[PDB]
Write a protein that binds this DNA or RNA. Structure first.
Ligand SMILES: [Zn+2]
Lengths: 121, 52, 104, 82, 118, 200, 50
RNA sequence: UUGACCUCAAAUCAGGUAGGACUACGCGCUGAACUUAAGCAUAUCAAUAAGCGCAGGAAAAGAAAAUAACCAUGAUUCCCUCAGUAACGGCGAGUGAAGCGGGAAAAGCUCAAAUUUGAAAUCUGGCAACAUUUCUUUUGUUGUCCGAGUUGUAAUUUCAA
RNA sequence: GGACAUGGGUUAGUCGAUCCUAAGAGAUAGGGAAGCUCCGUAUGAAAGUUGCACGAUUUUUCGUGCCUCCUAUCGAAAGGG
RNA sequence: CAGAAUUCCGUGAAUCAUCGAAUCUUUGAACGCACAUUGCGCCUUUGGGUUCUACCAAAGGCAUGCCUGUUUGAGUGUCAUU
């Protein structure tokens, strides 16, 4: 089977050529399966499909990493690139906004904060 | 359209429909000479700008 | 938290003493505790209750004084005891307030 | 006349397959599904029918995204590669 | 400000186009329905063999969402043969088949042998 | 300040100036849509008291609601029951027109949160209200500690749940013996729940 | 009626495919008791109802 | 002629937001009848069933326009008790709370109404830079510009003062 | 055997649908309705697609120039085509 | 049932377990208009067939209400030097 760490060391054009060759091999395997074949050759169909999935996955990571690099430290980034938590979590108040306090509240906290105290018998 | 018709009819309704003295004391503003003299003396004491 | 001693408001119960919600502003002033510092040191403040009798005023004032005497106030900055802070916070442990100041 | 011979002229569908729920309950002339209320922007449901409610409710289908949400919550909605 | 008509109409505005600050999708999708995603496999039934031998038409099993325009392009791109006409059929089992007739200079029998389903 | 003068002048609704302004403004509002955005509040002092601020994220909408009681929506006055439930004509809606106005504005502006509303005008047919709305997605609102609460999801459609001032007034929420059934369902549930303790 | 929509034809194709005899090996699977099936539908016994 | 202001439009304008599902519990609207009264109309069933709108992990309520009549208590909520009591009811059938007291838990607060007037000190957005991350996915800071805002954004005050 | 099992079989620019509109349905504006939703289809809407060359190296559909009762759609395998 | 010795001193079999990266068809609140039709459209860019405009293919888009800003505007609504 194709190794993912080996695939990640090659350029996108080479990966596309490998994907095209694998698709052609898969088509030929399907043709032989239709017009008579052996189980040894039929078992290669699943391996070819997995290798095609691996190549497509590796291309996807490369494209998404390039998009993340391009959109690094940018005000607005693609929706698929940004957070993927729940809808309520996404629109919930940020910790900074929830911790915002008025000047009067800040002065009250600074001058009269909760003290650590103890009692004796 | 509706907004042009409304504003013109509002002006007509204000011109008719006798106005109470508290609101009718308006509509008689300063004359040309007095207004331009007031604004001329007003333009000297401008309340600064952001740059200055 | 330390609670004041109050009289229930009916003839069926005015002969008893129970625990109140918080100490009045007059009681805090008489005991020498500011209303802002009372919350920080654990003294509840009740702005609605008032002292119509010197008996109730003194009864709660002595309770605040006993609480202050038995209270250890840790310094805001460790090793730098300020006004009212305790220099012997080493022997501090969690004790029941009513075990030293019960309602009588 | 009202019975067997009258049953011989029944060859005109009153309902067809609904595009939302898939049942043969989409009234053709009224353009409304008798089951799920399509095309109204709300699933038809009533409290007097509880068996109908449990026939078509959350958990009856695949729950493809709800299962992923539950898995993400159990780990705390974390992201990135270890 | 002379108006020769008693009806008021909305004046035309600039109506500028979209200049997004971010792409909604980070990566453009790879082209769906490629040549390998237009052809599934040849059909080697008795009728299909009769069509190949006696009519110079190859019988292929194509996807349901393909058309004759894309079938011709995929056949040309995969087997380097130029079709002359294509007929589309949807079998009762829910799958599409295509009768692809070849030109005189091209022989469907040799093309079928080159594919390898004979 | 002028806000004190505005508050004192708004009380004198029977004065000639106020009557004239009410007439021209009622005509002004009737010529407009039933619900329409107001560029600025017509009663700035009232808006300030209710919580409006002159900053981005605060929206004012004016709505007219038909006056009168609630006729029973039965086909031909037929109620199909005992005579005690046969009234069709002299029935009253349990919520006020102000509650109806703010709920309709909330539906019209579902992206905002209803804060308060105030009466501005009325005639025989319509009663006119101005509703204050706050944008929970605006940064000026999400960073303001004094209005930061409304961003939280627990205040979603508070006018629909009767959590506004007029909503709680219609619900009968209050303190004392006059409001013994302050939450009706909660009080009824407490008084009708049979508590069967395990005697051990 | 030889005049059928695409959705109808696809549903008929699905119904036809869900009518074949069950292969025996799945029934012979350990822990699998599929065996016989009453899901088989005949055109003259139980109608599809669109 | 033009600009400014005001009001009202259009744009596949820049950035966002709402719908729908789930309804055990929660907040409201609307709302019966079977039944009991040995009949039946008020009553009862029931401020329930059905219908409609709207949330969360809890919701709601909540810091007195509250009780009490006392040597007075002291936000809200819940449990016991008050109490099948006061009271309501063809005073028929039936219905039916609240103060005090004990306990669980306890936490307080924020605006509008003030002239900063020796300086709108306030806030959003665009751009750039620098930081940060459950995280290249998150959250900010600074500078500059443009807007909002004097028909009032900030600061000290909220009656306990 | 219309039964059971295994395979095969439906090929369109010219046949229909697709286009148009009928009875009707039904969005939108607007107005009711607590609301589910009801009425409404140039309706009390700033409801706009068609027609000339003003500029342009030169023998050509884009930026403006003033227009004028245009208008949602769905709805027939026997209507029209 | 096999197949797989491209397997075992090996970052490797498994319908194994876990799971923070992705893929995720047509639909559906469903969002170009519709839909008893896999029906009818529009915009941008890139390629193929003689096709600077027609056709085909691919990719990215075109719903409504509302909010804050931007641009272009309308008004016999109010204001000035030309
Ligand atoms: Zn349905």
């Amino acid at each position: 089977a194709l190794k993912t760490f080996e695939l990640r060391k090659q350029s996108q054009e080479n990966l596309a050529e490998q994907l095209q060759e694998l698709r052609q091999e898969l088509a030929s395997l399907r043709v032989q399966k239709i017009a008579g074949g052996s189980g040894s050759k039929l078992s290669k169909i699943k391996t070819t499909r997995k290798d095609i999935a691996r190549i497509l996955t590796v291309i996807n990571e490369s494209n998404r990493l390039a998009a993340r690099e391009a959109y690094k430290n940018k005000k607005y980034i693609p929706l698929d690139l940004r957070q993927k938590k729940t809808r309520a979590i996404r629109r919930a108040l940020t910790p900074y906004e929830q911790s915002r306090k008025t000047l009067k509240q800040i002065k009250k906290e600074r001058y009269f904060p909760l003290r650590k105290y103890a009692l004796k018998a | 359209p509706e907004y042009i018709r409304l504003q013109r009819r509002r002006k007509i309704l204000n011109l008719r429909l006798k106005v109470p003295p508290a609101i009718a004391q308006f509509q008689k503003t300063l004359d040309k000479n007095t207004a331009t003299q007031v604004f001329k003396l007003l333009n000297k004491y401008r309340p600064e700008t952001a740059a200055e | 938290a330390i609670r004041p001693a109050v009289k229930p408001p009916t003839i069926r119960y005015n002969m008893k003493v129970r625990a109140g919600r918080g100490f009045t502003l007059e009681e805090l002033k008489a005991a020498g505790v500011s209303r802002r510092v009372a919350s920080t040191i654990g003294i509840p403040v009740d702005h609605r209750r008032r002292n119509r009798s010197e008996e109730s005023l003194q009864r709660n004032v002595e309770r605040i004084k006993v609480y202050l005497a038995h209270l250890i106030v840790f310094p805001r900055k460790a090793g730098q005891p300020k006004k009212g802070d305790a220099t012997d916070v080493s022997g501090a442990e969690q004790t029941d307030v009513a075990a030293v100041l019960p309602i009588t | 006349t009202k019975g067997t011979q009258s049953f011989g002229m029944r060859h005109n569908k009153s309902h067809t397959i609904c595009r939302r729920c898939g049942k043969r309950s989409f009234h053709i002339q009224k353009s409304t599904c008798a089951c799920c209320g399509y095309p109204a922007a709300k699933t038809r449901s009533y409290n007097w029918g509880a068996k109908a409610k449990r026939r078509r409710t959350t958990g009856t289908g695949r729950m493809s995204y709800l299962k992923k949400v539950h898995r993400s919550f159990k780990n705390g909605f974390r992201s990135g590669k270890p | 400000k002379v108006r020769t008509s008693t009806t008021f109409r909305r004046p035309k505005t600039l109506q500028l186009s979209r200049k997004p600050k971010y792409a909604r999708k980070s990566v453009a999708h790879a082209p769906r329905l490629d040549e390998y995603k237009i052809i599934v496999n040849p059909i080697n039934s008795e009728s299909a063999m009769k069509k190949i031998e006696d009519d110079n038409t190859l019988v292929f099993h194509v996807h349901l969402k393909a058309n004759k325009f894309t079938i011709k392009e995929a056949v040309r791109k995969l087997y380097s043969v130029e079709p002359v006409k294509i007929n589309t059929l949807i079998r009762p089992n829910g799958t599409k088949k295509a009768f692809v007739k070849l030109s005189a200079d091209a022989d469907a029998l040799d093309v079928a042998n080159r594919i390898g389903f004979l | 300040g002028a806000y004190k003068y505005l508050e004192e002048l708004a009380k004198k609704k029977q004065s000639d100036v106020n009557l004239f302004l009410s007439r021209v403004r009622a005509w002004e509002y009737r010529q407009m849509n039933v619900i329409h955005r107001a560029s600025r509040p017509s009663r700035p002092d009232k808006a300030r008291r209710l919580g409006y601020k002159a900053k981005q994220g605060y929206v004012i909408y004016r709505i007219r609601v038909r006056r009168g009681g609630r006729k029973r929506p039965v086909p031909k006055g037929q109620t199909y029951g005992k005579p005690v439930h046969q009234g069709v004509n002299h029935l009253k809606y349990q919520r006020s027109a102000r509650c109806t106005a703010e709920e309709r504005v909330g539906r019209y502006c579902s992206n905002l949160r209803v804060l308060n509303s105030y009466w501005v005008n009325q005639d025989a047919t319509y009663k006119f209200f101005e509703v204050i709305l706050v944008d929970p997605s605006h940064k000026a609102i999400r960073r303001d500690p004094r209005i930061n609460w409304i961003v939280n999801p627990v205040h979603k459609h508070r006018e629909s749940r009767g959590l506004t001032s007029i909503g709680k007034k219609s619900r009968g929420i209050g303190k004392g013996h006059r409001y013994n059934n302050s939450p009706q369902h909660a009080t009824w549930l407490r008084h009708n729940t049979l508590s069967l303790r395990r005697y051990r | 009626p030889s005049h059928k929509s695409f959705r109808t034809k696809q549903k008929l194709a699905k119904a036809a495919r869900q009518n074949r005899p069950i292969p025996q090996w799945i029934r012979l699977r350990t822990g699998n008791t599929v065996h016989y099936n009453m899901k088989r539908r005949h055109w003259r016994r139980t109608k599809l109802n669109i």
